[PDB]
């Protein structure tokens, strides 16, 4: 039968998604995804693959349905949170990325994107906090020194900004 074939496309699809083979994931997972037999692992992996292959609205919507179906799933909160940052819905990204950072404290990208979201919302002290954690993870990331410098500057904290601007220029 096709049911066992179907199981094979599903797992291979999910595995393409996880490896960053996003086009191949879309090709496989479109053939398995079923909206009235909803499987959150397929939905979440096809969802991020859509966002990555340019079908941003279609993917966001699958990610949002995944969030409705599985409110505690950290993988969904990861891909949806980072997608909201990519589309500038900073509002909606913050709660999601906080929860993921609490669950995976050495996920650098999540911590950084949380800092970015907070910054763009004008929550500079919170932003700074997240940027210091991001620098503890990767002390030589130029982009974090630049973001934290800007955030300290926005608050009038020039003394604290200055070595971060010097470091971003050293790593440049």
Swiss-Prot record:
Disruption phenotype: Takes up less Fe(3+) than wild-type cells, is less responsive to magnetic field, cells have 1-5 magnetosomes (compared to 8-14 in wild-type). Cells have chains of empty vesicles. Magnetosomes are slightly further apart than in wild-type. Deletion of genes mamH to mamV (amb0961 to amb0978) gives cells with no magnetosomes and no magnetic response.
Keywords assigned by UniProt, alphabetized: Biomineralization, Magnetosome, Membrane, Repeat, TPR repeat
Domain of life: Bacteria
Alphabetical GO biological process terms: magnetosome assembly
Localization per Swiss-Prot or TrEMBL: Magnetosome membrane
The keyword Cell division belongs to this UniProt entry's keyword annotation: no
Any GO CC annotation of this UniProt entry: magnetosome
Topological relation to the membrane, as annotated: Peripheral membrane protein
Signal sequence interval, chain numbering: none
Site-annotated residues for Salt bridge that stabilizes NTD: 10, 39
Location of region: C-terminal domain (CTD): 73-172
Induction cue: Constitutively expressed, levels remain the same over 144 hours of growth (at protein level). Part of the probable 18 gene mamAB operon.
Region of interest (N-terminal domain (NTD)), ranges: 1-72
Task performed by this protein: Probably forms a large homooligomer on which other magnetosome subunits assemble. Required for formation of functional magnetosomes from pre-existing vesicles, it has a dynamic location in the cell.
Quaternary context: Oligomerizes into high molecular weight complexes (at least 560 kDa). Forms round, 20 nm diameter complexes with a central cavity. Interacts with full-length Mms6. Probably binds MamC.
Misc. comment: This bacteria makes up to 20 cubo-octahedral magnetosomes of about 45 nm in diameter which contain membrane-bound crystals of magnetite (Fe(3)O(4)). Expression of just the minimal mamAB gene cluster (amb0961 to amb0978), including this gene, is sufficient to form a minimal magnetosome chain with small magnetite particles.
Family: Belongs to the magnetosome MamA family.
Note on domains (UniProt): Protein missing TPR1 (residues 1-41) forms an N-terminal domain of TPR 2-3 and a C-terminal domain with TPR 4-6 which can move with respect to each other, hinged at D-72.
Protein name: Magnetosome protein MamA
Organism encoding this protein: Paramagnetospirillum magneticum (strain ATCC 700264 / AMB-1) (Magnetospirillum magneticum)
Gene it is expressed from: mamA
Region of the whole protein represented: 41 to 212 of 217
């Amino acid at each position: 039968n096709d049911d066992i074939r179907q199981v094979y496309y599903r797992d291979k699809g999910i595995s393409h998604a996880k490896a960053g083979r996003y086009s191949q994931a879309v090709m496989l997972l479109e053939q398995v995804y079923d909206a009235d037999a909803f499987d959150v692992d397929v939905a979440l992996h096809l969802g991020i693959a859509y966002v990555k292959t340019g079908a941003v609205d279609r993917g966001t919507e699958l990610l949002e349905r995944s969030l409705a179906d599985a409110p505690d799933n950290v993988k969904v909160a990861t891909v949806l949170g980072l997608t909201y940052v990519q589309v500038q819905k900073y509002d909606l990204a913050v709660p999601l990325l906080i929860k993921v950072a609490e669950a995976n404290p050495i996920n650098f990208n999540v911590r950084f994107r949380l800092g970015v979201a907070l910054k763009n919302l004008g929550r500079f002290d919170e932003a700074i906090d997240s940027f210091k954690i991001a620098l503890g993870l990767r002390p030589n990331e130029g982009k974090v020194h630049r973001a934290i410098a800007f955030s300290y500057e926005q608050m009038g904290r020039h003394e604290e900004a200055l070595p971060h601007f010097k470091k971003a220029n050293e790593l440049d």
